[PDB]
Design a protein around this ligand. Sequence first.
Ligand SMILES: O=c1ccn([C@@H]2O[C@H](COP(=O)(O)OP(=O)(O)O)[C@@H](O)[C@H]2O)c(=O)[nH]1
Ligand SMILES: O=c1ccn([C@@H]2O[C@H](COP(=O)(O)OP(=O)(O)O)[C@@H](O)[C@H]2O)c(=O)[nH]1
Ligand SMILES: O=c1ccn([C@@H]2O[C@H](COP(=O)(O)OP(=O)(O)O)[C@@H](O)[C@H]2O)c(=O)[nH]1
Ligand SMILES: O=c1ccn([C@@H]2O[C@H](COP(=O)(O)OP(=O)(O)O)[C@@H](O)[C@H]2O)c(=O)[nH]1
Ligand SMILES: O=c1ccn([C@@H]2O[C@H](COP(=O)(O)OP(=O)(O)O)[C@@H](O)[C@H]2O)c(=O)[nH]1
Ligand SMILES: O=c1ccn([C@@H]2O[C@H](COP(=O)(O)OP(=O)(O)O)[C@@H](O)[C@H]2O)c(=O)[nH]1
Ligand SMILES: [Mn+2]
Ligand SMILES: [Mn+2]
Ligand SMILES: [Mn+2]
Ligand SMILES: [Mn+2]
Ligand SMILES: [Mn+2]
Ligand SMILES: [Mn+2]
Lengths: 545, 545, 545
Amino acid sequence: TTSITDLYNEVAKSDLGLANPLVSIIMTSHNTAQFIEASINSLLLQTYKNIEIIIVDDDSSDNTFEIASRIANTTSKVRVFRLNSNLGTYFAKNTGILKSKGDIIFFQDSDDVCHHERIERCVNILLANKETIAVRCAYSRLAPETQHIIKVNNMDYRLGFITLGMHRKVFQEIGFFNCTTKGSDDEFFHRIAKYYGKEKIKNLLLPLYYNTMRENSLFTDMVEWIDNHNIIQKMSDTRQHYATLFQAMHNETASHDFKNLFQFPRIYDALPVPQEMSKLSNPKIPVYINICSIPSRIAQLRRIIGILKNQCDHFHIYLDGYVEIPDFIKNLGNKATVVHCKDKDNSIRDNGKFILLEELIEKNQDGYYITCDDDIIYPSDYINTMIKKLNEYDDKAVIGLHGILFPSRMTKYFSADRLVYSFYKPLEKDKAVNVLGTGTVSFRVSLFNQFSLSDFTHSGMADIYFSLLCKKNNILQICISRPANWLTEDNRDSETLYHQYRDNDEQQTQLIMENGPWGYSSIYPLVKNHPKFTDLIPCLPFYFL
Amino acid sequence: TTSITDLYNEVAKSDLGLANPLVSIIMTSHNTAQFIEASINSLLLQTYKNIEIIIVDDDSSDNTFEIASRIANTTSKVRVFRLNSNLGTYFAKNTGILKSKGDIIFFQDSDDVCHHERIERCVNILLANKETIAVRCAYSRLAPETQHIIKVNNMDYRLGFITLGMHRKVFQEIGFFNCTTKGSDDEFFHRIAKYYGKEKIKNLLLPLYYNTMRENSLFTDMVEWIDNHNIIQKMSDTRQHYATLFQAMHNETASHDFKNLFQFPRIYDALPVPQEMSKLSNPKIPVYINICSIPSRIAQLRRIIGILKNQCDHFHIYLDGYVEIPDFIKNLGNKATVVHCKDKDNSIRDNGKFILLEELIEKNQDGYYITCDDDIIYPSDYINTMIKKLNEYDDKAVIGLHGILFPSRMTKYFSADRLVYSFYKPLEKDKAVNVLGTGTVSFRVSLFNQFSLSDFTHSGMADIYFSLLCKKNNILQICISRPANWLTEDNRDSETLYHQYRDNDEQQTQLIMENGPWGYSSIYPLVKNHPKFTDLIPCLPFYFL
Amino acid sequence: TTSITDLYNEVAKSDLGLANPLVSIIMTSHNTAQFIEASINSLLLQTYKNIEIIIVDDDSSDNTFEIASRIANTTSKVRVFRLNSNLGTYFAKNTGILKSKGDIIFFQDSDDVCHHERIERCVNILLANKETIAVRCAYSRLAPETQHIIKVNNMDYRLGFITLGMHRKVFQEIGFFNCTTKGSDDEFFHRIAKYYGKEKIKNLLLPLYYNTMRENSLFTDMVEWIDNHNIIQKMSDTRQHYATLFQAMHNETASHDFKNLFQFPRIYDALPVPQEMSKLSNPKIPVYINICSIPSRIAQLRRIIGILKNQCDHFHIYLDGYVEIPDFIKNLGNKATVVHCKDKDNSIRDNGKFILLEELIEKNQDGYYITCDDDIIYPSDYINTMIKKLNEYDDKAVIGLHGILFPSRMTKYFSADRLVYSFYKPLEKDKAVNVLGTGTVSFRVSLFNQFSLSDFTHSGMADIYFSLLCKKNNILQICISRPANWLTEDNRDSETLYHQYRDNDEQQTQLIMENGPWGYSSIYPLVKNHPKFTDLIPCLPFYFL
Ligand SMILES: O=c1ccn([C@@H]2O[C@H](COP(=O)(O)OP(=O)(O)O)[C@@H](O)[C@H]2O)c(=O)[nH]1
Ligand SMILES: O=c1ccn([C@@H]2O[C@H](COP(=O)(O)OP(=O)(O)O)[C@@H](O)[C@H]2O)c(=O)[nH]1
Ligand SMILES: O=c1ccn([C@@H]2O[C@H](COP(=O)(O)OP(=O)(O)O)[C@@H](O)[C@H]2O)c(=O)[nH]1
Ligand SMILES: O=c1ccn([C@@H]2O[C@H](COP(=O)(O)OP(=O)(O)O)[C@@H](O)[C@H]2O)c(=O)[nH]1
Ligand SMILES: O=c1ccn([C@@H]2O[C@H](COP(=O)(O)OP(=O)(O)O)[C@@H](O)[C@H]2O)c(=O)[nH]1
Ligand SMILES: O=c1ccn([C@@H]2O[C@H](COP(=O)(O)OP(=O)(O)O)[C@@H](O)[C@H]2O)c(=O)[nH]1
Ligand SMILES: [Mn+2]
Ligand SMILES: [Mn+2]
Ligand SMILES: [Mn+2]
Ligand SMILES: [Mn+2]
Ligand SMILES: [Mn+2]
Ligand SMILES: [Mn+2]
C-alpha cells in the first residue's frame, strides 16, 4: 500500500520544476476549522517566498473565520475575507481573484494541504515557456486518520483542476469561474483549452497536492467505495447534464464572447443549471440598484460600478452637482437611468435613491430595490447576500447593515443614548433596529403599495424617513449579521452629512420626537407577530421602551 | 381571535351526528413521541366504545414506539406495529388497513388529537343513509403552545382528507392509498368520488379534528406565513404536478381497473412521481422471491402469497411433497415458476430457494434475490425494508433477520455456545453475524459471479452453506435491526427441521468445524475494510475469536 | 509491550483450576450500553454450563436496559432487573444476591469482559478444599481502542476484589456489601478475612478478568497517568478515610455482630461516610411503613417483612381478620405497632394504612410516610427510590406508581374512560395523575397539617379519599417512572377489592362526580405553579379537561 511518505520521496526524487512575480494563492473555507490552520501552515512553508495568501470564508458556522483572522493578524502574507452568505467555492475563488494583486493565481482548498515545493515547481513550469498560459499538477486523496492514499480509479495520483494555476490576465479575457456549487473547475479548464489551446496548458505528474478525504464533501456524489484504499469516481446525472451543457455551449459561442458571458460578480446563472447545482440567489424579478453620487467622490463611484455593473438589471444614479455625465456611467447604455439635477437648491441629495421606487409604485413592477451610497466599498457578494437574507425572511421585512437603536425617551438624535452598529463593524447575530442606514438598505418592492417622494420633506435624512415609512406599513427593519470590515468605508477626506448634521440635528430630533414610539416598543409587536422573527425577539425589552 | 374553546362550544351546540359495527382508527407515528400519547388518550376517550386503535410506526428514531407499545399493553383496544423502514404515512395507513378487523376505517395522525365525539358523529352520518360510502369532517390548525387557532386561507376550519372515514369494502374495490410521501389523500378522495360519486360522500362542517401546527412537517411546503394566526395554503410545484398527473389518470383509466392499479403491498410507484415524492424502494432491477413449501403448511403459504403476490416481479415456489399445484399459485400465471419434485429422496428441501439463483448466474440478470420460508408471517413492508437496507449498505453485503453468532472454538453447532437473534425477537442495532437464517435473507444477485446448487451437499442446512458461500466471496452478513415481533412465526403445530436436527446435527457440526474460522475472526477483517461497516465493528472482539 | 493475546496464552498455558452447583454471576450496569452486550456474550461463552446471569441496572439513562432485556429474552440463563434510582454498584450487587438462586456467587462489571474459562477454574479452586470459603483471581486493565494492557503499579495483572467469588452462605452470616459508591469491595474482603480467616481465601494468579479502562469511571480518582501503558493507583483522601474507618470498626465490633450491622436492604449508612461516598437516601427523619394485611395473603406479608424489616424506622401493620399475631411480626419487637381489630363490621380495611398518619398530626413528627399493600412484591430499592424521588421534587408532592387519569366528564369510575398505569407496567416519563393507588404512595408527613381518619367515610376506597385530601391541600400527585415489572403483583388466587367493587362502584362514582373537577383541570394549575413540575406540564390539555 502506497503512503504519503512514498509520495514525498517521489516528489523529492523528481527534478521537474527546478524574476519572481507575486503569486496569489486563493483558499476557500467552509466549516473546515479542523484543517484550515494546517492548510495555511502548509502554504506558509512554501519555498517560493514572494507569495500572498487570499482566503475567502464561505459563511462558515464554526470558528474557521476566527482562526483565519488570527493567522492573518500573525503575518502579512495572509489576507482574509468572509462572505456573509454561502455561495459555493467558485464564488469565493472569484472573490479572491478580485481581491488578489499577484500576476499569477493558484488555488488550494482549506481542507487540503500541499507539498512545500508545489508553487515553486508550478511557477517554474509555467514561466519556462512564454506561450504557456496555465499549469496544473497531479493531486491525490488521503485519509486524515491513517494518512494512507485513497486510490481513485485504481491510480495513486491523477491530474486535477483545483491545482491548476494560471496568469492574472487569464481571468480578464475569458471571464471567471462559473458560479455553481460544483463542477465549474472542469468547465473553466475546458474553456481555457478552447480559447488558448491544449498546447498552452502544462501538466506536472507530481503529487504536489493532497485532497483530504472527509465525509459529506462536495464530490462524495461521485464516490463509490470498494475498500478503505480504493474508490471509483464517476460523474453523477446532474454532473453529466452540466458537462454536456457547456461543451455544446463552447462550440455554439464565439471565444471572444466568453468575457461577455461569465462576468463576475453576477447574480444570475450563465447556464441553465438546476437549483441544486447553483447557490446563487437567482432572483425571479428584475434587480434595481439606486445610488446617489457627488463629484468629490466620483472615483469611488467608478469603483462601485466596477462591482455593481453586473449585479443588477437596472441602475438609478443620481448625480448631485456633477457637470457632465461620467464615461463609466454612459457606457452602461440603457441599463442605467441618470438623474442630473444641476441645482443644489432644488436638489434632494440622498432622497434620489428612492425616486425609482415611486415609479415602480406607478408600474407595479416587482423587484429587489437596493439603495447604496458612493462612499462605501461593496463586496462581490453583497447583492446575493441581501437577496438570500430577504428570501430567508420570506421578503417580509427590510434588511440593512447600518443599524441604529434608540429608546423612546431620547431627547437628541445624535446624543449618546443611541446605539450604532456600523456597516464596517461586525455583528454576531441579526438584530431588529429602529433605523437602518439607507446606504445598505435592500427590500422587495412589493412590500409597499403606495409611496410618494414628496413625503420626504427634508433632504439628508433618508434613514429617518425610510424608517417612518417602514413603521407606517408595519414592516420590520432587520440589521443582518456580517463579519468585521465587510463593507470598508472609503471617505477619502471628503465631506460627510454626518459631520454636517451632527451638531445641527434639530429637524431629525423633531421628527424622532414627533413620530414615536421607538425602541423595542416599536419592535416587540412586529417581532412577536411572525414565526420567522422568533430569533429576533428582544431578550429583556422592559428597559428599552 | 377564535380559540379551541370556541370550537368545542360550537361542536357541543350543533346536534349533527346525534347496531355498532367495529371501527378501526389507524394512526401513523413518526418521531412524534411528544404528541402520540396525547393522541391515543384522545382516541380512547371517544364516546363510541366499540373501537380499536391500530397504530403503525414509520421507523421513528425517538421513543415513540416505546410509548405506543406501553399503551398497547395497558389496554386491549390498542394494537401497535412498527415499520422497520421509513415509507411515508400512506404506506403505514395501508398497513393499518391490512392489520385492521373493523368494518369501518377512520384515520388520525399521531401529532394531532381529536374531539371526544368525532367518531360517534361520523359513524352516525355514515350509516344514516345506506348508499353512503364515506364521511369526512372539517379539521383545523392549532398552535401547540398558545392553543390558538391557525387560520388557513382566512377560515377557522376547513374540510380535509385525513378525517375521511369509509367502509372496509372501499379499500378492496378501488385499491389502497397511493404509496407516496404526501398528497395521496387528495388522490384517494378523488378516486372515491370518481368511482362511487360525489353524492356518496358526506361532509360534516364541524371542527372534530385538530391538526397540530409544528415546524418541519410534511405540509410546510404549502404554508406561507402572514402572522401568528393566519397562513396561506397553496400547492407546490411538485404537488401541482402530482395533482395534474392523477386527474388525467382517473379519466384515462376505467374505474374497475383501479383495483388492479393500486394493489397493496407494492414496491413500485403506480404513478410517474419524482424521487422526492415517493419513499418506496423502487428497484431498478427485477425482484425475485424464492420460497419452499410443504403441504402441512399450505394455508400459511397462501397467506404469504396474499402478502407477496405484488411485492416482486417473479416468484420461485418449490413445492416439496405437494400432490397438485394449489389454486393461489397457478392463478399467478407466468409470474410464478414452480418446481414440483414429487420424490422425497430426490428432494432438496430448502436448497430449492437457491435454484433460481443458479439460473441467474447463467443469465447475468441483476436483481434482488429474496429467500423466504413458509412458516413465517411477513409484514407488508418487508421487501421495501430489505431493499432500503441493501441500498443503505450500497448492495455490498447480504442482510437478514435470523442471526447466529458462535465462536471458532465451538464443538457443537446446536450447543449453548451460540447466540441466536431470532427474526421474531427485537434487535436495537444492526449486527454482523456468522450465519444468517435463509428464511429472511435478501441480497443483490450481482454480488455473486459463479454459483452452482450442486455445492450444497446436504439438504436442510441452507443457512450454513449460504454462510460458507458468503465467506468464500468475502461478502458480509448483516443481521439488520427490527422491532419486537416484526415477523411472527406461525408453526401451527407442524414439523420443523430445527426439532429434527437439534439432536442429530453431526453434518452441521462437521461443516462448521471443517470450514473455519468463525466468530469475529471471520467478521473483523470484513468489517474493517469498508467505511459503510464502521458502525458494525465489534466492540471487544478479543474474546469472541 | 504485553498484549491481551499474551494474557490468553498465559491462561491457556497454566493448568491451574483444571458435582456442578448452580453459579450466579451478578452484573451491574450503569450507562454501559456499548460494553454490556459484549460482557453478557463473554459470560454466556463460559465453559461452566450450569450458570445463571443476574443483571441489575443502576438506572441507566441510555439503552443499556433495553439490550439487557433483549438478551434476557433470547436465553433462559439471563435474568435482568432494573433499579429505578441510582444507588451505586454495591446496592445492585446486593440486589442481585437477593434475586439469585445459586449456591455460588460471582461478580463481573458490565463494562468489563472475562475469559471464557474464568468461572470453571474459580469454582474448581473454590471447591478443591472443603474449608475454602472464597476465591479471587487476578484482573487487568485494558484500553478498549488498542486492546493493549494498561499496567497498574508497573504490573501487568494484580489480584482484585471484583473477581472475588464465594458461597451463598457467606452473605447470610456477615451481611452484604456496604452500600457505598466505591471502596466497599475492599471492606467486604477484609470483613471475610476477619471473620473466616486468610487461609479461607484462595488466590489465582491468572488474568481471568479484563477491566476496560474508560474515562470518568469510579476509580479514576485513584489514577495518575504516566504514559499510555502505565498508571499509578493510589487511594484518595476520602478512600483513605473510609479505609481507616472500617479497619478500626472490624477490631471494635464482634464478628458475629457483622450480620446485625450490614443488613440488606437498608436506607441508612452503616458507617459514618460523607455524602459523596454514599448514594443511599439517608433520610434525616424517621421512616414509617404502613401496611394492611388479611390472613389469606399472610405468607406474602412475610415476604414483605423480609424486604422491609430494615428499610424503615417504624412499622404500622393492620391485621384485618387475623386470629393471632404472626411470629415474623412479633419478632420485630417495639419497632412494629400492630392494630388487631378482630371485627369485620368495625374494620376499616385499607384505611388503616393512614392510622399512624393521624397520630403524627397529633405529634408533629416529621417523616416519610409509606403506604404498602400485602399483595405486591416490593424490590430491595423501593424505599430509597421513593425518598430520592421525593427529594428530587423537594418533598413538595406525593409520589406513587399506580396512576389513574380520568376526565371530569366521566360518569362511571370503573368505565373505559379512565387510563390506568399499573405499578407492574413500565412508564417512560413521570406523569401527574388524578388518583394514585395507595399501595405505592410515599409522601413526607410535613405536607399535611391537619388530618383525621374519620373523614374516610367508606372503606376500600383509600385511593379516592387520599386523592381528595391531596387536592384539598393543593398537593400534586406524581406517577413516577419505573421499568417493566418493577413491582410484580402476587395475587396467588386470592380475593381482591377491585373484583368486588368493579361492578358495584356506586359510592366511588358518587364521590368522583361530587368532588370535581378532575383531569388536567385539577393538574394544570398545580403543575404551572412550580418550576420543579415544569417537565410534568401536559402537552395538549384542552381535551382532557
Ligand atoms: O458549499 C461549500 C462547500 C465547500 N466549500 C469549500 O470549498 C473547498 C472545496 O470543497 P470540498 O472540500 O468539499 O471539495 P472535495 O474535497 O470534495 O473535492 C473547501 O475548502 C470547502 O471548505 C465552500 O466554499 N462551499
Ligand atoms: O449634497 C449631497 C451630499 C451627499 N449626497 C449623497 O448622500 C449619501 C449619504 O451621504 P453621506 O455619506 O455624507 O452620509 P453619512 O454616511 O455621513 O450619514 C451619499 O451617497 C452621498 O453621495 C448627496 O446626494 N448630496
Ligand atoms: O415521513 C413521514 C412523516 C410523517 N409521518 C406521520 O404521518 C402523520 C402526518 O404527517 P404530518 O404530521 O407531517 O402531517 P401535517 O401535520 O403536516 O399535515 C404524522 O402522524 C407523522 O408522524 C410518517 O409516517 N412519515
Ligand atoms: O422436507 C422439508 C422440510 C422443510 N422444507 C422447507 O424448508 C424451510 C425451512 O424449514 P423449517 O421451517 O423446518 O426450518 P427451521 O425454521 O426449523 O430451521 C421451510 O420453508 C420449509 O417449508 C422443505 O422444503 N422440505
Ligand atoms: O454509579 C455507578 C457507577 C457505576 N456502576 C456500575 O458498576 C460497575 C463498576 O463501575 P466502573 O466500571 O466505574 O468500575 P471501574 O472500571 O472504574 O473499576 C460498572 O458495571 C458500572 O456500570 C453503577 O452501577 N453505578
Ligand atoms: O377486607 C379487606 C380487604 C383488603 N384489605 C387490604 O387492603 C389493601 C388493598 O386491597 P386489594 O389488594 O384487594 O385492592 P386492589 O389492588 O384490588 O384495588 C390490601 O393491602 C389488603 O390487604 C383489607 O385490609 N381488608
Ligand atoms: Mn476538500
Ligand atoms: Mn457616508
Ligand atoms: Mn400532523
Ligand atoms: Mn421454521
Ligand atoms: Mn468498569
Ligand atoms: Mn391489590
